[PDB]
Symmetry: C5
């Protein structure tokens, strides 16, 4: 098989609107943010403008193929695949995707999507001009799929040396969101960005 044959099988098999639930188990989505830049910080409005690479992985085993005598990975446009409907709950601008909208599909049915996103958040900016810094919390989860359909699991080298800001620490913790609006729970990742002005 060549790349074309692997991509054709994926296009015939993949259902972009259908969550690939195995049995009645949630789809396990891994999310890991790598901060690249902090561009604009407003301590009065408590807003920050950041660039991050959102490493997103999950499994769709119907897409699997025998790669003993074939390429074991291909690039695929996301419009041909199911992709998790992730959103940042405290975003105040739409996510601006800076990179080509291609995913990698691995021969065992693993899918990998790593968009570069520039986006604006409402978060705690107090202490940014201090030694201890500000801690800005970013919450990322499925918008429409509760914990029984999608589970989200989190997993300095990447941060631009040319930022006015410096990263002290990034903490990524599993979490769940619930409102009076809904009987169900929505899993998220809580990303704590502890940073300060240089």
């Amino acid at each position: 098989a060549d790349r074309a044959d692997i991509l054709y099988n994926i296009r015939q098999t993949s259902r972009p609107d259908v969550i690939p639930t195995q049995r009645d188990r949630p789809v396990a989505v891994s999310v890991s943010l790598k901060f690249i830049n902090i561009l604009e910080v407003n301590e009065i409005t408590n807003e920050v403008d950041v660039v991050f690479w959102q490493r997103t992985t999950w499994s769709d085993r119907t897409l699997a193929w025998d790669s003993s005598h074939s390429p074991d990975q291909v690039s695929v446009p996301i419009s041909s695949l199911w992709v998790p409907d992730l959103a940042a709950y405290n975003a105040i601008s739409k996510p601006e995707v800076l990179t080509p909208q291609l995913a990698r599909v691995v021969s065992d049915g693993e899918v990998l999507y790593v968009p570069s996103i520039r986006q604006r958040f409402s978060c705690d900016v107090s202490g940014v001009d201090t030694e201890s810094g500000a801690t800005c919390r970013i919450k990322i989860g499925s918008w429409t799929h509760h914990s029984r359909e999608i589970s989200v699991d989190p997993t300095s080298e990447y941060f631009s040396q040319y930022s006015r800001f410096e990263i002290l620490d990034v903490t990524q913790k599993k979490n769940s969101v619930t409102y009076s609006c809904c009987p169900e729970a929505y899993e998220d990742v809580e990303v704590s960005l502890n940073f300060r002005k240089k």
Copy 2:
């Protein structure tokens, strides 16, 4: 039936351009705004820039399926469904949808759509820097469907603690709009946002 089969049947049955009137009854659309952030307020121009979650529900009974041995809910792209043509009558910017454009369809034909919207309005901003605050009224109804085709019904834990502003009170009241030139009435929800700048 699996999710694929439910979504396939929805695609065969759904007519995104056709209002799902049951008999000839108006489609009852429930709208409920949850305020998340107030970003920009101008007391001189009487403009506000807000983020809100617009919880929108209605029923389309042709989408119903037997969920005895199937999932009773799926996520569906709104481009596959009829969605009410709601507009904010005092908006001065296009609604910016910040979330994935997916609805939930229940096996009994109930549809739920909850976009996060950032939008700019023309409204009364006087008193925002006072203790009693400003009251900004937002009016949301069907643009093209009068009261015989679409009825609109309204129904702190959501608001960002990091806003410069705080919410004193939110009131959502049914209302109707009618102009002298035309005989038809357009139902809307009137959302009264009573808020102020935090003191400090």
Copy 3:
């Protein structure tokens, strides 16, 4: 017939790219602006930023149906219909349509489209801070269809009480535009907005 049948038949019969000229007569397009807000006025650059509801009507008799025992009006996406190629001749920004892009089609073939438009114009802003006010003229006509293919005819309750400005008077009169290049005449509506700062 139900709404679905009327909309299906409209899709089969409507030719969105074909002007619905009856015989060899111009299509009569009726245009009526209702001013909602005046957001920005610049006396030095002679620019204004306005919101208006553009009530637009015309007739396409091929869309007609027997409504004796069916609904006599439906909402239709404008991408399914012919729409007049109207333009504001003194606009300096793209028209931002704020409302759903749906028209109403009546069973006799009358079409109604009322977009909410935010747009910026180059016009006479002198006297805006006086008691008599400024008179800003907006010209709206077909961009590509001369007077033999499209004719344009014009026809307090709407204006926001929260504007910094107030409307003294709005007058809408028929007009025709011609340039030294083109041998043909383009019909327009001339909308005179007499307004002032509060």
Copy 4:
């Protein structure tokens, strides 16, 4: 034949992705800018924001029809026919088209497209607040078709009377661009906009 039939036959015959080269001759494209407004001028960054009507004409004989007993002109969405891939070489913003994206097609195969464009340019703005004014040069030619495939030829009542600026002169001159990465030459029109602030002392 009625308008529907003419538009259907144009859809059948037109190849929007195929340059309509007659023989082995370049397609002769005529371009003529009419300046409507000058919105923003920055003498420090040497940037201008202008609105202009770009009268664009060419011929595509495979669109032709017998108009002895039918309309001799129709309006056509530009997505339905071939349009020249014109670009402004010194643009620093995308062209914002303000008007309906319709061309006029004549029964002899002549095509006319006149978008209203708002766009920002990098050009010489020095002298705008002087009596002799600034001369801002705008260069418009095919982006991908050299002089053997596309030739470009250029051809007061249009300019807004309400502008802060006044136009002293507009000159439109044929020209050719070449680079050392290319054996071929790209034809352009060079538009010299000589303008200044009104009401100086």
Copy 5:
């Protein structure tokens, strides 16, 4: 064959989503930035806004045709072709393409795409107001294709009306590797040494 026939065959043959790997070779992509303008520089935030023409070439041999008695080049909309998924690793805005999105396809299967791009970057702006200038490094490589699928190989153009002048542009092959991935991503590193006039 006329232009219509060549374009029709390209439309039938082209696979926009399939990297045109010949044999087991990485696709050799040649990238060359021509700087046209420097519009906005902020020495405090270390941001620049630039216009550049990105001359990009590669080969797709399935597109080849016999041009002995036909045109040997046509213009093709990029949406009909495979195009390398290049990204600027230090970009802080989307690339704004200012030009018609057309590639040239040559009868031997060579593809040429030269978009005009306006884009904002995070880079070293210190020294811009000095005689030796700032050196702003831009890194451009495949986002999703490692070195075994895509290989990247690198005055007349610059606007005389910029507030800035270019002292030197150096374009050097490079490779990017993270703990994130076992794989290496080839890039071009473009060093723009410029200063205020």
